[PDB]
Amino acid sequence: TQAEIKLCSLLLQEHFGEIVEKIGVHLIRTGSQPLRVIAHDTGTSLDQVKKALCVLVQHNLVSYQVHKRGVVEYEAQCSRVLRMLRYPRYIYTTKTLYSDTGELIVEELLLNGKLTMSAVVKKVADRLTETMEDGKTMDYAEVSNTFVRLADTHFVQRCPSVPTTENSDPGPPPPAPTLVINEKDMYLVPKLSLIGKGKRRRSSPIPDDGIYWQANLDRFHQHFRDQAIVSAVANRMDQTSSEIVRTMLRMSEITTSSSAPFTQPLSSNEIFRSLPVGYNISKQVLDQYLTLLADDPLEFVGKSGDSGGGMYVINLHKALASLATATLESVVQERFGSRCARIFRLVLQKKHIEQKQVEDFAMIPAKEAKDMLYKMLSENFMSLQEIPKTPDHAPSRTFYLYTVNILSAARMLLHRCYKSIANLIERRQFETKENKRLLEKSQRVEAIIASMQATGAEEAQLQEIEEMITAPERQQLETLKRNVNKLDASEIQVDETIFLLESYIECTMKRQ
Amino acid sequence: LPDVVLKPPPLFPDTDYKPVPLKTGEGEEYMLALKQELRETMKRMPYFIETPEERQDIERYSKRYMKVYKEEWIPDWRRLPREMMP
Amino acid sequence: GVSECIIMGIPMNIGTGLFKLLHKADRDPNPPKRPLIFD
Amino acid sequence: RSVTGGAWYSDQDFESEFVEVLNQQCFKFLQSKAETARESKQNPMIQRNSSFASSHEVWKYICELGISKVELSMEDIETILNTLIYDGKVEMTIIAAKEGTVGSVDGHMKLYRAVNPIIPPTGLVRAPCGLCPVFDDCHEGGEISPSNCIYMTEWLEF
Amino acid sequence: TEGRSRDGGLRLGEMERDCLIGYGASMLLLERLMISSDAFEVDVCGQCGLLGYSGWCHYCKSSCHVSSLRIPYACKLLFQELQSMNIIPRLKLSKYN
Amino acid sequence: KEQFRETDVAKKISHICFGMKSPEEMRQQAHIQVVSKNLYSQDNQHAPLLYGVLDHRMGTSEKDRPCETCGKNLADCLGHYGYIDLELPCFHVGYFRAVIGILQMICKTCCHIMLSQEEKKQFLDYLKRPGLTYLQKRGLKKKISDKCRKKNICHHCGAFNGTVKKCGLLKIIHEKYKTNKKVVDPIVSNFLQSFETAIEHNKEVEPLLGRAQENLNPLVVLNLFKRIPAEDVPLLLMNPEAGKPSDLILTRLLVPPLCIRPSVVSDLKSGTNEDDLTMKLTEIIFLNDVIKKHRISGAKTQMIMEDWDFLQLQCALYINSELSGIPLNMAPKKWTRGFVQRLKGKQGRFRGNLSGKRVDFSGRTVISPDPNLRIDEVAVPVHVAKILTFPEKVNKANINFLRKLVQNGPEVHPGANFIQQRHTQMKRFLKYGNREKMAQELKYGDIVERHLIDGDVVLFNRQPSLHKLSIMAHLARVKPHRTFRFNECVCTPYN
RNA sequence: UGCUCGC
DNA sequence: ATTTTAGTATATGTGCTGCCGTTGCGAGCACGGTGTTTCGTCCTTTCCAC
DNA sequence: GTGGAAAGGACGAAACACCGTGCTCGCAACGGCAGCACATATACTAAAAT
Numbered sequence A: 001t002q003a004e005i006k007l008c009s010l011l012l013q014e015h016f017g018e019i020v021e022k023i024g025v026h027l028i029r030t031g032s033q034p035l036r037v038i039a040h041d042t043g044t045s046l047d048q049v050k051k052a053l054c055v056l057v058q059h060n061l062v063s064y065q066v067h068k069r070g071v072v073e074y075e076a077q078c079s080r081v082l083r084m085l086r087y088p089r090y091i092y093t094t095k096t097l098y099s100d101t102g103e104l105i106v107e108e109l110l111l112n113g114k115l116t117m118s119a120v121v122k123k124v125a126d127r128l129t130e131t132m133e134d135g136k137t138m139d140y141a142e143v144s145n146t147f148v149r150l151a152d153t154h155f156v157q158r159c160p161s162v163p164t165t166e167n168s169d170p171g172p173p174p175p176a177p178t179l180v181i182n183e184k185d186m187y188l189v190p191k192l193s194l195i196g197k198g199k200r201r202r203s204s205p206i207p208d209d210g211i212y213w214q215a216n217l218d219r220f221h222q223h224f225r226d227q228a229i230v231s232a233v234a235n236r237m238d239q240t241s242s243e244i245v246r247t248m249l250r251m252s253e254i255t256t257s258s259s260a261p262f263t264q265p266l267s268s269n270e271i272f273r274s275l276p277v278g279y280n281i282s283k284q285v286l287d288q289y290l291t292l293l294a295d296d297p298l299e300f301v302g303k304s305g306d307s308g309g310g311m312y313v314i315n316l317h318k319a320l321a322s323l324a325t326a327t328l329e330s331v332v333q334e335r336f337g338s339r340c341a342r343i344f345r346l347v348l349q350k351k352h353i354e355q356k357q358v359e360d361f362a363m364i365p366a367k368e369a370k371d372m373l374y375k376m377l378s379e380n381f382m383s384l385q386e387i388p389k390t391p392d393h394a395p396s397r398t399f400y401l402y403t404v405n406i407l408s409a410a411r412m413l414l415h416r417c418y419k420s421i422a423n424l425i426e427r428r429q430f431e432t433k434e435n436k437r438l439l440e441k442s443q444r445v446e447a448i449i450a451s452m453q454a455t456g457a458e459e460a461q462l463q464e465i466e467e468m469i470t471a472p473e474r475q476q477l478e479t480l481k482r483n484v485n486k487l488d489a490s491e492i493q494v495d496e497t498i499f500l501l502e503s504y505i506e507c508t509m510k511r512q
Numbered sequence B: 001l002p003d004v005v006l007k008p009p010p011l012f013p014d015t016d017y018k019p020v021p022l023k024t025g026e027g028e029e030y031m032l033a034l035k036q037e038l039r040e041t042m043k044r045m046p047y048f049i050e051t052p053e054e055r056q057d058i059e060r061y062s063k064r065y066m067k068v069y070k071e072e073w074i075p076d077w078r079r080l081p082r083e084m085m086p
Numbered sequence C: 001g002v003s004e005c006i007i008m009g010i011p012m013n014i015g016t017g018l019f020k021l022l023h024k025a026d027r028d029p030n031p032p033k034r035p036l037i038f039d
Numbered sequence D: 001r002s003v004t005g006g007a008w009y010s011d012q013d014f015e016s017e018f019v020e021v022l023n024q025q026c027f028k029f030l031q032s033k034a035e036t037a038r039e040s041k042q043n044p045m046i047q048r049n050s051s052f053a054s055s056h057e058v059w060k061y062i063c064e065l066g067i068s069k070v071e072l073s074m075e076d077i078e079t080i081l082n083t084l085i086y087d088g089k090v091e092m093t094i095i096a097a098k099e100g101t102v103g104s105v106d107g108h109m110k111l112y113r114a115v116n117p118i119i120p121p122t123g124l125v126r127a128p129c130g131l132c133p134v135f136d137d138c139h140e141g142g143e144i145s146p147s148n149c150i151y152m153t154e155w156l157e158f
Numbered sequence E: 001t002e003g004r005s006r007d008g009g010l011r012l013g014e015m016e017r018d019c020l021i022g023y024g025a026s027m028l029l030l031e032r033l034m035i036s037s038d039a040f041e042v043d044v045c046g047q048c049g050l051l052g053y054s055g056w057c058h059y060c061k062s063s064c065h066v067s068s069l070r071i072p073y074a075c076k077l078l079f080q081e082l083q084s085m086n087i088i089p090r091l092k093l094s095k096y097n
Numbered sequence F: 001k002e003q004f005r006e007t008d009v010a011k012k013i014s015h016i017c018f019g020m021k022s023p024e025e026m027r028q029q030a031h032i033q034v035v036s037k038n039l040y041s042q043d044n045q046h047a048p049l050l051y052g053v054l055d056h057r058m059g060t061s062e063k064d065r066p067c068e069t070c071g072k073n074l075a076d077c078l079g080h081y082g083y084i085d086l087e088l089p090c091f092h093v094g095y096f097r098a099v100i101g102i103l104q105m106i107c108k109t110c111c112h113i114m115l116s117q118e119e120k121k122q123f124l125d126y127l128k129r130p131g132l133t134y135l136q137k138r139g140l141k142k143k144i145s146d147k148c149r150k151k152n153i154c155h156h157c158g159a160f161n162g163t164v165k166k167c168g169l170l171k172i173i174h175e176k177y178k179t180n181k182k183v184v185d186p187i188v189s190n191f192l193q194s195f196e197t198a199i200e201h202n203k204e205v206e207p208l209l210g211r212a213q214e215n216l217n218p219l220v221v222l223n224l225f226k227r228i229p230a231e232d233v234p235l236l237l238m239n240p241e242a243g244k245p246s247d248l249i250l251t252r253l254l255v256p257p258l259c260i261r262p263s264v265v266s267d268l269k270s271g272t273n274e275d276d277l278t279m280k281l282t283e284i285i286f287l288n289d290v291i292k293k294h295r296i297s298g299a300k301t302q303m304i305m306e307d308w309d310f311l312q313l314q315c316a317l318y319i320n321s322e323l324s325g326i327p328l329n330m331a332p333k334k335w336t337r338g339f340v341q342r343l344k345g346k347q348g349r350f351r352g353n354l355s356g357k358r359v360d361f362s363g364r365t366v367i368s369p370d371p372n373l374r375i376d377e378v379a380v381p382v383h384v385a386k387i388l389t390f391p392e393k394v395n396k397a398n399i400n401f402l403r404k405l406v407q408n409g410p411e412v413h414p415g416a417n418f419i420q421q422r423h424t425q426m427k428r429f430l431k432y433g434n435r436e437k438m439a440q441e442l443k444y445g446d447i448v449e450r451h452l453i454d455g456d457v458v459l460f461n462r463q464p465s466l467h468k469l470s471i472m473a474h475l476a477r478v479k480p481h482r483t484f485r486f487n488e489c490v491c492t493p494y495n
Numbered sequence G: 001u002g003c004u005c006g007c
Numbered sequence H: 001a002t003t004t005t006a007g008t009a010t011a012t013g014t015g016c017t018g019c020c021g022t023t024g025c026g027a028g029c030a031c032g033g034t035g036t037t038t039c040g041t042c043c044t045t046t047c048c049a050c
Numbered sequence I: 001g002t003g004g005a006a007a008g009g010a011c012g013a014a015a016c017a018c019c020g021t022g023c024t025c026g027c028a029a030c031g032g033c034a035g036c037a038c039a040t041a042t043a044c045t046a047a048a049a050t
């Protein structure tokens, strides 16, 4: 996981600083370790170690556990540091599904990690008072309504709460309070009757204290998986099937967990009555749609029952496997051409196959199909079976069969995407550092205008800003800006493939 | 037999396949702008702990004028173990 | 060890190399320091 | 036909242009048929059945086209459509039909339809790092570094 | 060299080294097996621990941490052969004090 | 004006930290890339080719042609390494056992180590103790390997992990789809039924469907090692700063300098004497070129894998020229001298060049009895005394003696042969030039290589050494005869 | 590399 | 529900095919060096005719 | 005594891999400490009959 460690290091350096990213990388590489050995191995002062650990545990990146002799050990969550990159996508999806109020709520929750409901609604009101003008004030009522609406949809979840010290072992305080998680009050918001109006940044006791909230990344991952499945089935059959499967997944969201081979089956009657009335679709049309989706050779849905009219179920693991297969065939096509993609799909459909059979079934002339096969072998896109006639395993007396393993190829592609995003971040930081001189020059020549904006603002300071030598350098500034924009766009768009591969790898494990 | 090569292969061999252009739309641009805003706003956040400057040359009357002032968040010591108190 | 001392070309710790020698030179440890007038 | 000759081999030379033209024409025909089926919008089952094209139908269509002089059998068009399936562009289904205008397989008929891909190109291929051939030799400090990369330089310049 | 026709010198064998060890003559053994036989001065970089040349380290592309060191030539040959065998010996130098 | 930089420091080596190098580090350390399989040019001068083997940019091996990297002669050139890129990765014969061990330690699907969280914490706490010795490290590795081989299912991803063993030579087989006498799992059934097309096109696949386990070629092993989490690296008893699991599989070969590969220009014939390492590297480059040619020309998979196995075998022979599992048809014709053979043996580096080596300023002579000498005195012939010289430093005490010694010259027995000045280290031969002027200009601190005279402490030894008394330091007395004479009473120690 | 020797 | 038999499950304990060693230093000498198998370019020498 | 054309003999030279063909042996040089395959023994555990 060297690429993962490098990506986490880059993220922690760009987001938190230097003295904290070292502690984070040490925790990721060495695992759970007490505080004193961490401070000894890192080589910095104890106060910096404490500050780094606290600022990491605030954003739920690391956890602390008790062990023998009452020692506390801190373990980092590399998965959480990787999910930290998905913050813009989380904000975009919470702005799409909800209003800008929920957008600001999720933004503050991600930027602070753990906060109380009063604090987040106050910050959201203070930030939204700037969006509007003309003396209009922001009340806490609609903000609390949006917060509880996000809560009942499991998008925001209460942080693990420390048990009561008086009731649980009254006496000597333990080194760690041993925070536990309760599912009863996991999504129960507190009753806060106090309201207020946000201030407009003029620059001229807590009822919900102890109750901290955070963003439930599992709900966002489930929503992204549902959106990906809907987009796939829309590209496959039609938009009507996409709406049908969207309604089915919306019904299944509540009654199912985040990891299950099959969801809870639904009947045709409840799917018909739950479908939005905007579609002029009858019962028989829905029955035909379901029975044609069940016959799809991709197995997105399944019958799995005949009671209650049309009883149907949705295959989640099969859909994720199909999405991973599509991603792999797409990257193969874009990296080696359409003919190599044809060979890949041939060797994927046929579980085991040889060179002559590949040439016969793909109709690709010799000296070229073998070349693409060897190229894919050199990039770990497939593995040879090598069935031996004799235990000597001599090459002259054995058969070599080509076979694509989706799991290993998906893991390799995920590692490649991690290293790609790491290289993109490195290139962006390099371009920023090499041009920091022009950046400071532009910042100064623009702060000349930013200073004395209204008070003592003479017009004689507007025709001298571009008089300097910065005007021919504005072209280099624009090139740097567009390069950074494109690098960030690519880094964000690779995160979708990363999410797909990570979901495929997670849903195929048992964790026994 | 394979031919002999006088010079090593190029450090970056050319490829006839180019990367697919990035997806376009209001969503991708909004996500890019939001990521840039997060980059700009998270460095000034108190959670972003900077390297403590040291080895001051001299003390001056202008120290109070150039003294960096920034509000510091107070961690909840109830959830955090006792070992991280200053 | 002795073998690594022989290989690396350094005097081995055993034998005459167990101890160190000092020179009985005319000196004065902790010599008087010039006082600082400005500080 | 296996040891010598063949509809694709011409004087011991594989005709890549011929199979390319066959694939393009078959894909265009299947796409037009699927477009007509979609625009018909009479009934989803009827739409799917009309989007389906039998091997005999597309074989007769290719014979009506007459691109090449060599006679193309039904199994030749079947192999061409199988190669198109391997390209990720069309889908084949085996339905039960005792006898009809095809009569090729006993009680089974292969219907082909043009289908759109599952997902658009992924985000990995949109970055130069995902399509790099020397990706293994990438390192922070060295001759091949992301800071002085030529691929990303040309990609940002473009 | 080995023989008299090749103008060779006498070899201090393993048993002679054992006798010199038993006597405890560390300086005599050092002069015989290092100074008078295969003495050499190499350049070692204190950062990466590799061998440099002419006070310069090609690995780190720097010359601030490069320092001279006395060594038997056979030991340098062994280190180079081990580096050829992917067994990289990293030397962490330090002051004699 | 002038920057203060230290000239020389009395640096003493503390300890040697062994480790491994990644291919990127191999590229960074090397100066040039070797791609030409030939040695010399076509012209009659037979100059070494550029960017190929025997190139002078990787040091020099001839007294006339200096190094191209550093402008120094053969005596001052320390040598430079090179890097050769391999088309296909190959297992390192030295770490092949380590490769098998690591593959047995970690899972073959998620690359995680086969250890529960409690066992992980226990092993980490046992390893965190200070003063960990080599024996303790090897014992901990053995215990963790046993506890990992005890398990059969992965607690991280749930994938099955069968036995991993060595088949043939430099080939690893993982028995993922093992035969289950009880009710079979769905995974093995799907694996067996996935061969439908293979059986339809090749019936011979069906009888040989059994024993079809996973074959871990260097590509898959390297891909797995590149995805190993760094947290589990200390659990493998391998130091993270020393190396990484991906370094065990070699993709670049470090060709050594010319100092390790001496070349003799035999002008008497049309050929040169080269060591075996140069020929092995030439064969490896030729195999890489042949593999690339077959990849371009589209060869069959059987011959491609045969060339890959041949390249692996040649790399192993370049590393260790004495293997056991070499096939008879793949066995070498002659005997080569690899690095392992150069290290081990009676004539190896440790025993022949490190523990016991040859020295100068020594003589060997037949002995004859002489009772008229003391037991602590030994008679040295005049002829040997004129050859074995002692460097005396000019001081305030022996100035008038060294003056007369220089005046006598290298012909008279009491005298010297060479004078090394204090300021300049340019030696001066006493056989030429005015010796009187040299004696009159003898400054304090100069070195005079005086002849062996009476009173000099001299070691006297008999090569067969049983006890320490076989070699003793006596006082040399010069005699006109030609034998080493000493008191016969000291005959019993020397035997 | 081989071999004959010298103790 | 309880005692008896079947299996499995690992550990242990006796082999059998591997890899590693085998005194020291000295002095001579003879031989052979990677090449060779067939293809082709070049040069020269000599079957008849002059 | 001469010559224009012809053959052949010798020395570079490139494809392939030290052996003409594909075969093919013997002997271990003697212990001796690791082992890894098998094998298999026994008991623990749980299903079945009374």
Ligand SMILES: Nc1nc2c(ncn2[C@@H]2O[C@H](COP(=O)(O)OP(=O)(O)OP(=O)(O)O)[C@@H](O)[C@H]2O)c(=O)[nH]1
Pocket: F264, G001, H031, H032
């Ligand atoms: N057949 C044979 N092999 C030899 C001869 N000399 C050396 N060798 C081989 O070469 C190896 C020893 O080489 P050395 O004797 O060190 O060669 P060298 O004396 O350094 O060679 P120069 O540098 O030319 O003097 C042995 O393993 C032998 O197999 C010889 O005269 N005949």
Ligand SMILES: Nc1ncnc2c1ncn2[C@@H]1O[C@H](COP(=O)(O)OP(=O)(O)OP(=O)(O)O)C[C@H]1O
Pocket: F464, F495, G007, H023, H024
């Ligand atoms: N192979 C050897 N290893 C070590 N030393 C040896 C060897 N061969 C000879 N020597 C030397 O020669 C000496 C052997 O002589 P020794 O055996 O005591 O008398 P000898 O040869 O039996 O004479 P006699 O036959 O008794 O007249 C001792 C040893 O230093």
Ligand code: SF4
Pocket: A423, B012, D128, D129, D132, D134, D135, D138, D144, D145, D146, D147, D148, D149, D150, D151, D152
């Ligand atoms: S050369 Fe540049 S673009 Fe290519 S893989 Fe390396 S860092 Fe990425």
Ligand SMILES: [Mg+2]
Pocket: G007
């Ligand atoms: Mg004797």
Ligand SMILES: [Zn+2]
Pocket: E045, E046, E047, E048, E049, E050, E057, E059, E060, E061
């Ligand atoms: Zn260095």
Ligand SMILES: [Zn+2]
Pocket: F057, F058, F059, F060, F067, F068, F069, F070, F077, F078, F079, F080
């Ligand atoms: Zn050099």
Ligand SMILES: [Zn+2]
Pocket: F107, F108, F109, F110, F111, F112, F154, F155, F156, F157, F158, F159
């Ligand atoms: Zn696993």
